[PDB]
Every structure is written in C-alpha cells, then in structure tokens.
Amino acid sequence: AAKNVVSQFVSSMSASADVLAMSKIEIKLSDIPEGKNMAFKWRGKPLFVRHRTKKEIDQEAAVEVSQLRDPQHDLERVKKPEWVILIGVCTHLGCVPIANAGDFGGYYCPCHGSHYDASGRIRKGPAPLNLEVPSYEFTSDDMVIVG
C-alpha cells in the first residue's frame, strides 16, 4: 500500500501530461530544402534545423579542431551529416542568430559580435560554448523528433 501511495505522490511532482505534450516536436525533413534554414518554436525557444549541402558537409569536415574556442569535430555534433539541428539561442547573453550570414557563413549575431560556422560552432566572437546540440533521433528517413 505505502509503496503505491508514496510512489503516486512522487509522480505528482514529475512533469504533467501537458508538459510532456510540449516536450517533443516533430519536423518533416522534406519541408526544408538543401541549403536553407528553417526555424521552429520548441520549449519556448527557437529551434534551427538546417539541410546542409555536399559543399557545407566537406567544408565543415576538414576545419581545424584546435583553433576553435570549443573543440568539436562535425561528425560527432550530428547524427546524419546532411542535417544539423541546434537551439537558436546565442550562448553568451541570449539572442536569436540570423541564418545564412556572418563571416563564417552560417549564423551571425548583431548583439555583441559572434560568428558561428555552418556546423554551429563559435569561430570569432565573445560566446563561450557553441550553439547547443539537442537530444534527438531520426525515426523514418522522412521525419525527425526533437526531444
């Protein structure tokens, strides 16, 4: 009995069904063309999914690993090479980076002076971490669930 009663009361404090409802967001991958970025509303934040070209894949592959402020290779930032999924919150003091711009040709911020590459990694600016890589999995080849 006491196991059940306690365990229910513990359950009370964990996320309600309506908070679990906003946990995940489904994105259709055929709705974003090769090269263009598409923004989404996720957990009250922007969420950038970007279809990357054969050029953007190879150009972000052979980048210098050491020179970066936050050393991460590209093939471990993503699950599929042609898709990079990121939270659209600038890591320094919280802005929304604008797509297809900046020095490093990816995301740029007119708040302080940050430049992200096509892989979402900070190259030249005041930001301390790269743009945040969320938890996600591809289900069927056409669809992605983020969360």
Binding site: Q8, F9, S11, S12, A17
Partner: protein, 378 residues
C-alpha cells in the same frame, strides 16, 4: 534506566505516546482524537501537493484545479482525497464532540475550550478551502456567508468589504483566502498540541464517568494497536468515497466556473455547515439570524456550566440518554432542512428544529440531570 525516559525529545514521546497511563475500558469513541490527527496530517500533505499545482488568480483558478485532475499525475486521487478528507475530518469532529457531550469529558475545561477553538479553526479553514476551486457554490457560498457580517450595526458594512478587499468577493479575496487557508492548518496543529498538553494533565475520561486510576493500562501496545485499526477503518471510509463516489458529499454546481451574474438555484454551504445554516434561516431578522448561527457553535463553551447531574457520564442516566439522542436526531433534521429550499413545510420544520436545539441544551438536558438526581435521592 532507558533512553526513552532520558533523551529530551524521546521523553516527551515516551510520556505522551508509549507509557501514557490510559483507562482500561475506553471505547471506540476515544479513537476519534487519533483520527482527527490523521485527518489533519492527511489534509496538510494532500493540500501541500495540490498547492504545488494550484493558482489563486481568479482567471486561472478553476482551470488549475481541473488541470490537477486531468494532467497532473495522480492529481485527481490527491484532489478528491483532499475534498473527501475534509468531510472525513468533520465526521470525525462531530463524533469526537458527541463523545465529549455524552460521557461528560467537557468537565476537563481547558481541554474542552481549546477543543471549541480547534473546531472554530477547522471551520474557518474548510469554509475558505471550498472557495478555492472558484466554482459557483464556492463563489456564491462565500458571498452570502461573508455578507452576513454586514448585519452588525455601524461597522458591519465596512468589515465585509475589508475581508473582501474590494466591493465583492473577487481577485483580492481569492488570493488571501488561499494564504489564510494555507497557514491555518499549521495554527491548528499548534493548538492541537496544546489541546493534548492539557489532556495529559488529567489523563483520559472513560465510558463509566468514574475515575479509572485503579485500572490503567499502558498506551502501548493496547491503544497503539487499536489506533492502527481505527486508522485503517478511516482510510477505508475515505477511499470508499474517493474511488467509488467522489462526488457524493459535494455539489454539482461547483463544476461550472464562478459567474457573478448567474445565481445557482439553491445556494448552500457544504454538508457540515448545514445544521447551523438552517438555524440562521429560522430567525426572520438578519442580525438575529447571525447571532443565532454564531451562538449555535459558541454554546459548546457554555455546556460545562450547564452540567447539573451528580454523575459525570450519561451511561447511568436514561433520561439524559434519550434527550442526547434527540439532540443528535434534531441536528440530523437541521442538516436535512439546511439542504432544502426556503418554503412550506421546511420553514416551519426548520423553526421547530432550531427551537428544539437550544431548548435541549439550555433547558431540557439540565432539567433532566436534576430530575435524575432527585430520583437517586441526590
């Protein structure tokens, strides 16, 4: 020597809980104290867990309570435990008081009067609790009952608007009712501890109303095991309501949100106020009705002074026994009448029941005591 009698914290526990000398012969009517404690703790836990999800803002309030029942995990079972737990509290309270009356435990004056205070505090808590869902009966119940205080000359009208924090029961009233409703149970817990502190000055009364010093048994294990059995039966009653009829003791109109225009058909408080609600409606004058409703509870403080019998308990007192059971049946009548619309024959029955309530306490049961005495050459 042991570390139950030695340790400053265990000492209080050992004396008031384990080695407490208890009469050998105390009946089921002595379980209600323990059960009141369980009720209070049950309300506090369930209540606290509900307060993690509720909001006192008038727009979101009704929605939050329903959000608890539909989206919050086991929020429904918590919510309905808390609502039926409030009923279980009042069942326990009136049974507990009845015991006191019948067996004359009220002679323990301080214990008794602290009781009266506790009763009044639980009432205040439960009145303000029922407002929190912000349904029709919530809002309209609160409006009518609060606004009775306007019947006081000179100040009454100000007083009402000061409780409200406005010109009707609105935003500031709901928010403060949440704050008072949160704090009061904790004040209850304190006063309940003082209640027992005075009880342990004398120890317990018993069914005979004759002193039991000659035959005391230690509280453990005898009454620890009985209290567990009692607790078990309380949980059964509660869960029978919660899992089989959670709406039985409430009202449907509290499932539509509060509307300051649209008045419900027969506006009424929750069942445990109905007896005193009927007394209010008996008197034609409004201030008279308020003073009668107030005296219908406060008269409990007067009971010890009205005691006439040379015997303490009603066990050995046939006339008093009948008059007592009449007083119970009358209260059951007032509860029924309280739930009815103001019409024939419920007006006249209500008047007649309210007359009989005060007549039984202030005249008949005192007379019966003295008649019983003169029958025993006393």
């Amino acid at each position: 020597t042991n570390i139950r009698k030695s340790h400053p914290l265990m000492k209080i526990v050992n004396n008031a809980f384990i080695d407490l000398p208890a009469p050998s012969n105390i009946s089921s009517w002595w379980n209600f104290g323990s059960l009141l404690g369980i009720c209070l703790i049950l309300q506090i836990l369930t209540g606290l867990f509900l307060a993690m999800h509720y909001t006192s803002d008038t727009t979101t309030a009704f929605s939050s309570v329903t959000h608890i029942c539909r989206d919050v995990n086991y929020g429904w079972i918590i919510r309905y435990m808390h609502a039926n737990g409030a009923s279980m509290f009042f069942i326990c309270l009136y049974m507990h008081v009845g015991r006191g009356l019948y067996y004359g435990s009220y002679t323990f004056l301080e214990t008794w009067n602290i009781g009266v205070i506790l009763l009044l505090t639980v009432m205040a808590t439960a009145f303000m609790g029922y407002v929190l869902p912000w349904g029709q009966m919530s809002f309209w119940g609160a409006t009518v009952i609060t606004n009775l205080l306007s019947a006081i000359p000179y100040i009454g009208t100000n007083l009402v608007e000061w409780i409200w924090g406005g010109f009707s029961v609105d935003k500031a009233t709901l928010t403060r009712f949440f704050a008072f409703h949160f704090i009061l149970p904790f004040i209850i817990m304190a006063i309940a501890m003082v209640h027992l502190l005075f009880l342990h000055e004398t120890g317990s009364n018993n069914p005979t109303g004759i002193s039991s010093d000659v035959d005391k048994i230690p509280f453990h294990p005898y009454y620890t095991i009985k209290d567990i059995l009692g607790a078990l039966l309380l949980i059964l009653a509660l869960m029978l309501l919660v899992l089989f009829a959670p709406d039985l003791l409430g009202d449907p109109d509290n499932y539509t949100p509060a509307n300051p225009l649209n008045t419900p058909p027969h506006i009424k408080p929750e069942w445990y106020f109905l007896f005193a609600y009927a007394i209010l409606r008996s008197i034609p004058n409004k201030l008279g009705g308020v003073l009668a409703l107030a005296f219908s509870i406060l008269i409990l403080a007067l009971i010890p002074l009205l005691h006439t019998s040379k015997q303490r308990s009603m066990m050995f007192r046939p006339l008093s026994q009948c008059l007592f059971w009449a007083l119970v049946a009358d209260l059951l009548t007032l509860t029924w009448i309280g739930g009815q619309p103001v019409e024939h024959p419920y007006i006249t029955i209500g008047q007649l029941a309210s007359v009989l309530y005060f007549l039984l306490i202030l005249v008949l049961m005192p007379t019966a005591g003295t008649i019983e005495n003169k029958l025993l050459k006393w």
